Enzyme design. Structure first.
Site, PDB file in Angstrom:
ATOM      1  N   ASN A   1      -3.954   2.677  13.246  1.00 30.92           N
ATOM      2  CA  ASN A   1      -4.271   3.870  12.476  1.00 30.92           C
ATOM      3  C   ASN A   1      -5.420   3.614  11.536  1.00 30.92           C
ATOM      4  O   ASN A   1      -5.193   2.936  10.515  1.00 30.92           O
ATOM      5  CB  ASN A   1      -3.041   4.246  11.629  1.00 30.92           C
ATOM      6  CG  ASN A   1      -3.252   5.517  10.749  1.00 30.92           C
ATOM      7  OD1 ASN A   1      -4.217   6.278  10.916  1.00 30.92           O
ATOM      8  ND2 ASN A   1      -2.330   5.714   9.783  1.00 30.92           N
TER       9      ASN A   1
ATOM     10  N   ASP B   1       5.362   3.056   5.850  1.00 29.34           N
ATOM     11  CA  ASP B   1       5.986   1.872   6.353  1.00 29.34           C
ATOM     12  C   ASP B   1       6.149   1.018   5.128  1.00 29.34           C
ATOM     13  O   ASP B   1       6.976   0.085   5.061  1.00 29.34           O
ATOM     14  CB  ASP B   1       5.214   1.259   7.540  1.00 29.34           C
ATOM     15  CG  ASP B   1       3.768   0.945   7.264  1.00 29.34           C
ATOM     16  OD1 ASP B   1       3.117   1.811   6.653  1.00 29.34           O
ATOM     17  OD2 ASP B   1       3.281  -0.133   7.767  1.00 29.34           O
TER      18      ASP B   1
ATOM     19  N   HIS C   1       0.874  -1.212   0.000  1.00 31.53           N
ATOM     20  CA  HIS C   1       0.000   0.000   0.000  1.00 31.53           C
ATOM     21  C   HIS C   1       0.877   1.216   0.000  1.00 31.53           C
ATOM     22  O   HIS C   1       2.082   1.128   0.190  1.00 31.53           O
ATOM     23  CB  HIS C   1      -1.115   0.011   1.085  1.00 31.53           C
ATOM     24  CG  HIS C   1      -0.682   0.144   2.505  1.00 31.53           C
ATOM     25  ND1 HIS C   1      -0.211  -0.960   3.212  1.00 31.53           N
ATOM     26  CD2 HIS C   1      -0.807   1.146   3.416  1.00 31.53           C
ATOM     27  CE1 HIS C   1       0.038  -0.595   4.439  1.00 31.53           C
ATOM     28  NE2 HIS C   1      -0.319   0.665   4.621  1.00 31.53           N
TER      29      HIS C   1
HETATM   30 CO   LIG Z   1      -0.579   1.536   6.504  1.00 31.98          CO
END
Ligand SMILES: [Co+2]
EC number: 3.5.2.6
Length: 215
Positions: free
Chosen positions: A168, A78, A74
């Site tokens: 998150n 990170d 994605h």
């Molecule tokens: Co993420």
């Protein structure tokens, strides 16, 4: 399982398999290193360029082959954060079109946008399937499947046992995430290991955990 760290405990690799390793960098974040006959392939790189360069250098030295390809699961950091390093080294950075569209929007250099809903790649003898199951942790999250091992890379779509909440959710789709998880369970009915985005490796129970966290 054999486990190898760099000097700091900042980057660690754990052997799942003759040719499949989990890389973890310090939150800890996970991806895979695929030791193939034609080079090293990473599922995800690392948090930023500094850690991505260190990861690549560690694995190139150990495995005595170049990193040739990375699959980005994605468009968050990170995940997208080492893209500059990949592009400047000539490492192919695969992603869906949506992930590339989101990377650009957010000011990152763009991965290839070559992955479709289901894409089958072969790197030497190593078979890799990418699958977009729908929205969840993010709009664009994909999973990666190794059909020769029945190993699933869940990425941030899948929470580890130790995760007691969703993390998150600012970019998440909490009402479609459960359907997306169901889509993965329907496609991959016999799973040997599931690698979460963060945390310890598990099995299909991690997908069931994620479902419960969504209630
Ligand atoms: Co993420």
């Amino acid at each position: 399982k054999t486990v190898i760290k760099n000097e700091t405990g900042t980057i660690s690799i754990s052997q799942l398999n003759k040719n499949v390793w989990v890389h973890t960098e310090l939150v800890p974040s996970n991806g895979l290193v695929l030791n193939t006959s034609k080079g090293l392939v990473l599922v995800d790189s690392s948090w930023d360029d500094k850690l991505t360069k260190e990861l690549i250098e560690m694995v190139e030295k150990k495995f005595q082959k170049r990193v040739t390809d990375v699959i980005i699961t994605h468009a968050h950091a990170d995940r997208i954060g080492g893209i500059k390093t990949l592009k400047e080294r000539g490492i192919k950075a695969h992603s869906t079109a949506l992930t590339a569209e989101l990377a650009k929007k957010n000011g990152y250099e763009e991965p290839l946008g070559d992955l479709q809903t289901v894409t089958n790649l072969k790197f030497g003898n190593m078979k890799v399937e990418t699958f977009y199951p729908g929205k969840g942790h993010t709009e664009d999250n994909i999973v990666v499947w190794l059909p020769q091992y029945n190993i699933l890379v869940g990425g941030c779509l899948v929470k580890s046992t130790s995760a007691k909440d969703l993390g998150n959710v600012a970019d998440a789709y909490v009402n479609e995430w459960s359907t997306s998880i169901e889509n993965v369970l329907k496609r991959y009915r016999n799973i040997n290991a599931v690698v979460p985005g963060h945390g310890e490796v598990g099995d299909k129970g991690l997908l069931l955990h994620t479902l419960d966290l969504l209630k």
